[PDB]
């Protein structure tokens, strides 16, 4: 049962980075090098592993996190980084064991006049934990006076929409991202590679 990787990488709709969704993958065989070779990938780094080696390995469970950002921010989807995305939207742990997959989707998530549906958290009073997810739309109190709901000075709606237009620069164009994380518990491994000892 080769897993539904196409269910995630080929999903017609992707989430905003602030409300990134996670797909638990389990009970299947994973052909990671076939995923590598499906190509059209501008970023494909693995931390602590190699694709070729890991489709000989198995793990307890695998998780696929997907969302949209833009080109200049994919660097933030790496361990130990800072910035609006890593600090306020999607944070990876320093001991990350997985791969980060990203590819330009300007042909799909941009439109003439701008696609404002993709959002990202602009303000947050503390940085996120690794793999924490905060979807709060409450107005952000940037100063010492309370907002009492109303938008006003020092009181901002916390989410900003990307201005995705087909004519933006490489760094301001949409990029779909998928982060695979490999969970090895002291428990039966149910996501194996074709070349593992299990198959």
């Amino acid at each position, epitope marked *: 049962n080769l897993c539904p990787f196409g269910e995630v990488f080929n999903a017609t709709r992707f989430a905003s980075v602030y409300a990134w969704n996670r797909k638990r993958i389990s009970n299947c065989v994973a052909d990671y090098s076939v995923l590598y070779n499906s190509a059209s990938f501008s970023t494909f780094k693995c931390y602590g592993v190699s694709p070729t080696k890991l489709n000989d390995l198995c793990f307890t469970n695998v998780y696929a996190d997907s969302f949209v950002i833009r080109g200049d921010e994919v660097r933030q989807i790496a361990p130990g980084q800072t910035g609006k995305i890593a600090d306020y939207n999607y944070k990876l742990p320093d001991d990350f064991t997985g791969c980060v997959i990203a590819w330009n989707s300007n042909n799909l998530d941009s439109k003439v006049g701008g696609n404002y549906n993709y959002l990202y958290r602009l303000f947050r009073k503390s940085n996120l934990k690794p*793999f924490e997810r905060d*979807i709060s739309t*409450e107005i952000y109190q940037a100063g010492s006076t309370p907002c009492n709901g109303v938008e006003g000075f020092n009181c901002y709606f916390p989410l900003q929409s990307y201005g995705f237009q087909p004519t933006n620069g490489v760094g301001y164009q949409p990029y779909r991202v998928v982060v695979l994380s490999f969970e090895l518990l002291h428990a039966p491994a149910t996501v194996c590679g074709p070349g593992s000892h299990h198959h």
Partner: antibody
Amino acid sequence: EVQLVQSGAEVKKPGESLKISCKGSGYSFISYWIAWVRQMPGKGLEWMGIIYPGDSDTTYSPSFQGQVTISADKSISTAYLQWSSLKASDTAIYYCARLLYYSDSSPLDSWGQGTLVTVSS
Amino acid sequence: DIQMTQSPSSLSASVGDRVTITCRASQSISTYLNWYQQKPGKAPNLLIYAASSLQSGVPSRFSGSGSGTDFTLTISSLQPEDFATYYCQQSHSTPRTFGPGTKVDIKR
């Protein structure tokens, strides 16, 4: 089906240890904070503390700091509440609850059913 | 600790009534206020968060308003399932604190 399920009722004597559990399913357990709330017989609700299962970072209410331990085991998607020496005054119902998110109103959007703890000699 | 108050402490109402419960905080809490429902033998359920945001799955007849120190929970038309105790909870400061709750019994 986001759900938290707590362990069953407990009957202990003063001075004994106790550990109760709160198992979560239907969501990414490591990605949301867990609160513990006390409700003493015929009383209201008291916020005891919070924990982030991803790394077990905890912040207690000052009224409960040093009186109880909040811990977690992400490998089985479970949070704990733990006493080393029980007192009769600990007789109450204890709930665990998920925070929809950490910031702002930090609402408790999903609760476990509660664990009744009875301390009696 | 921020002290949360609710009035009335108890309320008699009839099915179909418009019921309003108030919550007062000992200091301003912007709109960092949540409302919960609890019935005997049951665990609380979230009704309203951030003063006026309706939790998904909650009937539309529930609504919240207010800010600063004054808040109100309103039920447009009381239904048989709505007889219960209602708590407010401030999230402006740590430690989080709840109001003492207001029970809404059937009028007779």
